[PDB]
Amino acid sequence: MFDIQEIRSQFPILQEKVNGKDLVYLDNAATSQKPKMVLDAINNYYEHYNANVHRGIHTLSQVATEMMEDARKKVQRFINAKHDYEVLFTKGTTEGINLVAYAMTDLIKKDDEIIISYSNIVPWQMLCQRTGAKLRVIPMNEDGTLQIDVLDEWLSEKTKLVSVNQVSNALGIVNPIDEIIRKVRAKSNAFIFIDGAQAAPHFEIDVQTMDCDFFAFSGHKMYGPTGTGILYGKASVLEQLNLPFRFEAGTPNIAGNIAIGTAVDFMEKVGRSNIAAHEHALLEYAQRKLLEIEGLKVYGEKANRAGVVSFNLSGIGIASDVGMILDKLGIAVRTGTVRASFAVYNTFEEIDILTEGVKKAQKMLA
């Protein structure tokens, strides 16, 4: 029971016009748009329940505290964490990364090794600057995939942390996380950090079967407010760093944490398999229609990808030239390649608008 029109009716910004045109929002990998239930949660919190949490004894403080803890349990079930106290509220993926990178400082000695995948690589580069650790980077192949067989030679007793993004943000490539984790468990005692910021909006997460040690993601990419994120960690691993209060300092973003639970509710209401199916059909259709344009190349064309078509036109260098023409047609994409990225509310009719817009751009720029 998947009604694209019922879904789109929940997103008020979809009625917005841009340069006199219907908004065609295909920059979802940058940030997603928000359904009414999430915005209602924010507003209802501030108009009825706002108070500080945990420390207080009066009624509003009790209700506010309970609502935030209810939201933690929604996220727990959403990623199938075994315990609510393994779910930490943060302000974004970048915060979760920095939290782990700083807390690892004491567990890394003078010649240990950190392995990362191919712009938040600074915390790990800084962690190696503090310790005596050597940073190692998994190379990317030409087609955008990771050269993960390098782990067969790099993993050793020296490897203390491996950090991989589950989905690449530029190309949308789904990295082979289960094979990587299996390799890391078999040949090292390293902690495994998975950046799921581009994964959590698009397909179901089960951190228990995934066997990651950490899993981090951002609310704003998955229909939630800015300023929110989640860091999951195995209790047995969190307890080695320096629950969940130990890792949540200062006043929490109470409203945002409540509302990211409402964004979980929205996804569960739509259906996570329905989202994946609809988005996979959008992606296949868009890549098919775009490849009919003469001279257009699709990066990672043969790769398994989540919600992202990246492309370049043959004779057009500044991709922004195409992006500006598309924006004047109402189409929002990321721009030396053009990145169109899908969310649950996008339509096949919108992809046709994109494809006709790209054809028009290339002859405009000829």
Coordinates of C-alpha atoms in Angstrom, one line a residue:
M1 CA 0.0 0.0 0.0
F2 CA 2.5 2.6 -1.3
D3 CA 0.8 5.8 -2.5
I4 CA 3.4 8.3 -3.8
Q5 CA 0.8 11.0 -3.8
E6 CA -0.1 10.4 -0.2
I7 CA 3.6 10.5 0.7
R8 CA 4.2 13.8 -1.2
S9 CA 1.2 15.4 0.5
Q10 CA 3.1 15.1 3.8
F11 CA 6.0 17.4 2.7
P12 CA 4.9 21.0 2.5
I13 CA 8.1 22.3 0.9
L14 CA 7.2 20.2 -2.2
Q15 CA 4.6 22.8 -3.2
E16 CA 7.3 25.5 -3.2
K17 CA 8.2 27.2 -6.5
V18 CA 11.8 28.0 -7.6
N19 CA 12.5 30.6 -10.4
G20 CA 8.9 30.4 -11.3
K21 CA 9.0 26.6 -11.6
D22 CA 7.8 23.6 -9.6
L23 CA 10.6 22.5 -7.2
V24 CA 12.2 19.3 -8.3
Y25 CA 14.4 18.5 -5.3
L26 CA 17.1 16.0 -6.3
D27 CA 19.8 17.0 -3.8
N28 CA 18.7 14.6 -1.1
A29 CA 22.2 13.2 -0.4
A30 CA 23.0 16.8 0.7
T31 CA 19.9 16.9 3.0
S32 CA 16.4 15.6 3.0
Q33 CA 13.1 17.5 3.2
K34 CA 10.8 17.0 6.2
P35 CA 7.3 15.5 6.6
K36 CA 4.6 17.2 8.6
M37 CA 4.6 14.7 11.4
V38 CA 8.3 15.6 12.2
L39 CA 7.6 19.3 12.1
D40 CA 4.5 18.8 14.3
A41 CA 6.7 16.9 16.8
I42 CA 9.1 19.8 17.1
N43 CA 6.3 22.4 17.5
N44 CA 4.2 20.2 19.9
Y45 CA 7.3 19.8 22.1
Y46 CA 8.0 23.5 22.4
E47 CA 4.3 24.4 22.9
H48 CA 3.5 21.8 25.5
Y49 CA 6.4 19.9 27.1
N50 CA 9.6 22.0 27.0
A51 CA 11.7 21.7 30.2
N52 CA 15.2 20.5 31.0
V53 CA 15.6 16.7 31.3
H54 CA 16.8 14.1 33.7
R55 CA 17.8 16.4 36.6
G56 CA 14.4 17.9 37.3
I57 CA 11.5 16.9 39.6
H58 CA 8.6 19.0 38.3
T59 CA 6.0 17.6 35.8
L60 CA 7.2 19.2 32.6
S61 CA 10.7 18.0 33.2
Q62 CA 9.4 14.5 33.9
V63 CA 7.4 14.5 30.7
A64 CA 10.2 16.0 28.6
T65 CA 12.6 13.4 29.9
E66 CA 10.3 10.5 29.2
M67 CA 9.6 11.7 25.6
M68 CA 13.4 11.9 24.9
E69 CA 13.9 8.4 26.3
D70 CA 10.9 7.1 24.2
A71 CA 12.7 8.6 21.2
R72 CA 15.9 6.8 22.2
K73 CA 14.0 3.5 22.2
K74 CA 12.5 4.2 18.8
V75 CA 16.0 4.6 17.4
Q76 CA 17.2 1.5 19.2
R77 CA 14.5 -0.6 17.6
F78 CA 15.1 1.2 14.2
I79 CA 18.8 -0.1 14.1
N80 CA 18.1 -3.2 16.2
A81 CA 20.5 -2.2 18.9
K82 CA 20.2 -4.7 21.8
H83 CA 20.1 -2.0 24.5
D84 CA 18.6 1.5 24.6
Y85 CA 21.8 2.6 26.4
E86 CA 23.9 1.8 23.3
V87 CA 22.1 4.6 21.4
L88 CA 23.8 7.9 22.0
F89 CA 22.3 11.3 20.8
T90 CA 24.7 13.5 19.1
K91 CA 24.5 16.6 16.9
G92 CA 25.4 14.9 13.7
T93 CA 27.6 12.2 12.1
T94 CA 30.7 14.4 12.4
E95 CA 30.2 14.7 16.1
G96 CA 29.9 11.0 16.5
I97 CA 33.1 10.5 14.5
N98 CA 35.0 13.1 16.7
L99 CA 33.6 11.5 19.9
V100 CA 35.1 8.1 19.0
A101 CA 38.3 9.6 17.6
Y102 CA 39.0 11.5 20.8
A103 CA 38.0 8.7 23.1
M104 CA 40.3 6.2 21.3
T105 CA 43.4 8.4 22.1
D106 CA 44.2 6.4 25.2
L107 CA 43.9 3.0 23.5
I108 CA 46.3 3.8 20.7
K109 CA 50.1 3.4 21.3
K110 CA 53.2 4.6 19.5
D111 CA 53.1 2.4 16.4
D112 CA 49.5 1.2 16.1
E113 CA 47.6 1.6 12.8
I114 CA 44.2 3.1 11.8
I115 CA 42.6 2.2 8.5
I116 CA 40.0 4.4 6.9
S117 CA 38.2 4.4 3.5
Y118 CA 38.9 6.9 0.8
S119 CA 35.9 15.4 4.4
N120 CA 35.7 14.2 8.0
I121 CA 39.1 12.4 7.7
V122 CA 40.7 15.0 10.0
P123 CA 39.7 13.4 13.3
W124 CA 41.5 10.2 12.3
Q125 CA 44.4 12.2 10.9
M126 CA 44.4 14.2 14.2
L127 CA 44.2 11.0 16.3
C128 CA 47.3 9.7 14.5
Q129 CA 49.0 13.1 15.2
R130 CA 48.3 12.8 18.9
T131 CA 49.4 9.2 19.2
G132 CA 52.3 7.7 17.3
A133 CA 49.8 5.9 15.0
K134 CA 50.1 5.5 11.2
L135 CA 47.0 6.3 9.2
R136 CA 46.3 4.1 6.2
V137 CA 43.7 4.7 3.5
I138 CA 41.9 2.0 1.5
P139 CA 42.3 3.0 -2.2
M140 CA 39.5 3.5 -4.6
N141 CA 39.4 1.7 -7.9
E142 CA 38.6 3.5 -11.2
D143 CA 34.9 2.5 -11.0
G144 CA 34.5 4.1 -7.6
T145 CA 34.6 0.9 -5.5
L146 CA 36.9 0.2 -2.6
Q147 CA 40.1 -2.0 -3.1
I148 CA 39.2 -3.9 0.0
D149 CA 41.6 -6.8 -0.7
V150 CA 44.4 -4.5 0.6
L151 CA 43.1 -5.4 4.1
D152 CA 44.5 -8.9 3.5
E153 CA 48.0 -7.4 3.8
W154 CA 47.4 -4.4 6.1
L155 CA 45.4 -6.1 9.0
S156 CA 47.6 -7.2 11.9
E157 CA 48.0 -7.0 15.7
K158 CA 48.8 -3.3 15.0
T159 CA 45.3 -2.5 13.6
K160 CA 43.3 -0.8 16.3
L161 CA 40.5 0.9 14.4
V162 CA 38.9 0.5 10.9
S163 CA 36.5 3.1 9.8
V164 CA 34.4 2.7 6.6
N165 CA 31.4 4.5 5.1
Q166 CA 28.6 2.2 4.3
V167 CA 27.5 4.3 1.3
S168 CA 29.7 6.7 -0.5
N169 CA 28.2 10.3 -0.5
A170 CA 29.6 11.4 -3.9
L171 CA 28.6 8.4 -6.0
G172 CA 26.2 6.5 -3.7
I173 CA 28.2 3.3 -4.0
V174 CA 27.2 0.6 -1.5
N175 CA 30.4 -0.6 0.0
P176 CA 30.7 -4.3 0.9
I177 CA 30.5 -3.8 4.7
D178 CA 29.8 -7.4 5.6
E179 CA 32.8 -8.7 3.7
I180 CA 35.0 -6.0 5.2
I181 CA 33.9 -6.7 8.8
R182 CA 34.4 -10.4 8.3
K183 CA 38.0 -9.7 7.1
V184 CA 38.6 -7.3 10.0
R185 CA 37.3 -9.7 12.6
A186 CA 39.3 -12.6 11.2
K187 CA 42.7 -10.9 10.9
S188 CA 42.7 -8.2 13.7
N189 CA 41.4 -7.1 17.0
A190 CA 40.5 -3.7 15.6
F191 CA 37.4 -1.8 16.5
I192 CA 35.0 -1.3 13.5
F193 CA 33.4 2.1 13.0
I194 CA 30.7 2.3 10.3
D195 CA 29.6 5.7 9.0
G196 CA 26.0 5.0 8.0
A197 CA 25.0 8.6 7.3
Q198 CA 24.1 7.8 3.7
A199 CA 22.8 4.4 4.5
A200 CA 20.2 5.0 7.2
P201 CA 17.8 7.0 5.0
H202 CA 17.8 4.2 2.3
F203 CA 17.7 0.7 3.7
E204 CA 17.2 -1.2 6.9
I205 CA 20.0 -1.3 9.4
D206 CA 20.6 -4.2 11.9
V207 CA 23.7 -3.5 13.9
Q208 CA 23.5 -6.8 15.7
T209 CA 23.8 -8.8 12.5
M210 CA 26.1 -6.2 11.0
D211 CA 28.4 -6.7 14.0
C212 CA 29.8 -3.2 13.8
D213 CA 31.4 -1.8 17.0
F214 CA 30.1 1.7 16.2
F215 CA 27.4 3.0 13.8
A216 CA 26.9 6.7 13.2
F217 CA 24.3 8.6 11.2
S218 CA 22.6 12.0 10.8
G219 CA 19.0 13.0 11.3
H220 CA 18.9 15.7 8.6
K221 CA 19.5 13.1 5.9
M222 CA 16.7 10.9 7.0
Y223 CA 13.7 13.2 7.2
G224 CA 14.7 14.7 10.7
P225 CA 15.8 18.1 11.9
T226 CA 19.2 19.6 11.5
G227 CA 21.5 19.4 14.5
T228 CA 20.7 15.7 15.2
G229 CA 22.5 12.5 14.9
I230 CA 23.0 9.1 16.5
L231 CA 26.1 7.2 17.6
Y232 CA 25.5 3.6 18.4
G233 CA 28.2 1.5 20.1
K234 CA 28.3 -2.0 21.5
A235 CA 28.0 -1.7 25.2
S236 CA 31.2 -3.8 25.6
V237 CA 33.1 -1.4 23.5
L238 CA 31.7 1.9 24.9
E239 CA 32.7 0.6 28.4
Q240 CA 36.3 0.5 27.2
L241 CA 36.3 4.2 26.2
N242 CA 36.4 7.3 28.5
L243 CA 25.8 4.7 30.0
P244 CA 24.4 6.5 27.9
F245 CA 24.9 9.6 30.1
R246 CA 28.7 9.3 30.2
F247 CA 28.8 10.3 26.5
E248 CA 26.1 13.0 26.5
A249 CA 27.4 16.2 28.1
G250 CA 25.7 19.5 28.5
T251 CA 22.0 20.2 27.8
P252 CA 20.9 17.7 25.1
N253 CA 19.1 18.9 22.0
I254 CA 15.8 17.6 23.5
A255 CA 13.5 18.8 20.7
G256 CA 15.8 17.4 18.0
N257 CA 16.1 14.0 19.7
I258 CA 12.4 13.7 20.1
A259 CA 11.9 14.7 16.4
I260 CA 14.5 12.2 15.1
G261 CA 12.3 9.6 16.8
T262 CA 9.4 11.0 14.8
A263 CA 11.5 10.7 11.7
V264 CA 12.0 7.0 12.6
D265 CA 8.2 6.8 13.0
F266 CA 7.7 8.3 9.5
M267 CA 10.0 5.7 7.9
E268 CA 8.4 2.8 9.8
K269 CA 5.0 4.2 8.7
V270 CA 6.0 4.2 5.1
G271 CA 7.8 1.0 5.3
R272 CA 11.6 0.5 4.9
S273 CA 11.3 -2.1 2.2
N274 CA 8.8 0.2 0.4
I275 CA 11.3 3.0 0.5
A276 CA 14.2 0.9 -0.8
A277 CA 12.0 -0.5 -3.6
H278 CA 10.7 2.8 -4.7
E279 CA 14.1 4.4 -4.7
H280 CA 15.7 1.5 -6.5
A281 CA 13.1 2.0 -9.2
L282 CA 13.8 5.7 -9.4
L283 CA 17.5 5.1 -9.7
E284 CA 17.2 2.5 -12.5
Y285 CA 14.8 4.7 -14.4
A286 CA 16.9 7.8 -14.1
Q287 CA 20.1 6.0 -15.1
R288 CA 18.3 4.5 -18.1
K289 CA 16.8 7.8 -19.3
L290 CA 20.0 9.7 -18.7
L291 CA 22.2 7.2 -20.7
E292 CA 20.0 7.9 -23.7
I293 CA 21.4 11.4 -23.9
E294 CA 24.4 11.2 -26.3
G295 CA 27.8 11.7 -24.7
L296 CA 26.5 11.4 -21.1
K297 CA 28.6 9.2 -18.8
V298 CA 27.4 7.7 -15.5
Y299 CA 30.1 7.2 -12.8
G300 CA 29.9 3.8 -11.1
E301 CA 27.3 2.8 -13.7
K302 CA 27.7 -0.9 -13.1
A303 CA 28.0 -0.6 -9.3
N304 CA 25.4 -1.3 -6.6
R305 CA 24.3 2.2 -5.5
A306 CA 21.8 3.8 -3.1
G307 CA 19.8 6.7 -4.4
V308 CA 22.5 8.6 -6.4
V309 CA 23.1 9.0 -10.1
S310 CA 26.3 10.9 -10.8
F311 CA 27.0 12.0 -14.4
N312 CA 28.9 14.4 -16.7
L313 CA 28.2 15.7 -20.1
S314 CA 30.8 15.0 -22.8
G315 CA 31.7 18.5 -24.0
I316 CA 30.7 20.5 -20.9
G317 CA 33.5 21.2 -18.3
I318 CA 32.1 23.4 -15.6
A319 CA 29.4 21.1 -14.2
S320 CA 28.0 24.2 -12.5
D321 CA 27.1 25.5 -15.9
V322 CA 24.7 22.6 -16.2
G323 CA 23.6 23.0 -12.5
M324 CA 22.7 26.7 -13.0
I325 CA 20.6 25.9 -16.1
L326 CA 18.9 23.1 -14.1
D327 CA 18.2 25.4 -11.2
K328 CA 16.5 27.9 -13.5
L329 CA 14.2 25.1 -14.5
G330 CA 13.4 24.4 -10.9
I331 CA 15.7 21.4 -10.6
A332 CA 18.0 21.1 -7.6
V333 CA 21.1 18.9 -8.0
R334 CA 24.6 19.0 -6.7
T335 CA 27.4 20.4 -8.9
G336 CA 33.1 18.3 -12.3
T337 CA 30.1 16.1 -12.3
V338 CA 26.3 16.4 -11.7
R339 CA 24.8 14.5 -8.8
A340 CA 21.1 13.7 -8.7
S341 CA 20.0 12.0 -5.5
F342 CA 16.6 10.6 -4.6
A343 CA 14.4 10.4 -1.5
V344 CA 11.0 8.7 -1.0
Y345 CA 8.9 11.6 -2.3
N346 CA 10.6 11.8 -5.7
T347 CA 8.7 10.7 -8.8
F348 CA 9.3 9.3 -12.2
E349 CA 7.6 12.4 -13.6
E350 CA 10.4 14.4 -11.8
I351 CA 13.1 12.3 -13.5
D352 CA 11.6 13.1 -16.9
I353 CA 11.8 16.8 -16.0
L354 CA 15.5 16.2 -15.0
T355 CA 16.3 14.4 -18.3
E356 CA 14.6 17.0 -20.5
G357 CA 16.4 19.6 -18.5
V358 CA 19.8 18.0 -19.1
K359 CA 19.2 17.7 -22.8
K360 CA 18.2 21.4 -22.9
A361 CA 21.3 22.4 -21.0
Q362 CA 23.7 20.7 -23.3
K363 CA 22.3 22.4 -26.4
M364 CA 22.1 25.7 -24.6
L365 CA 25.8 25.3 -23.8
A366 CA 26.8 24.1 -27.2

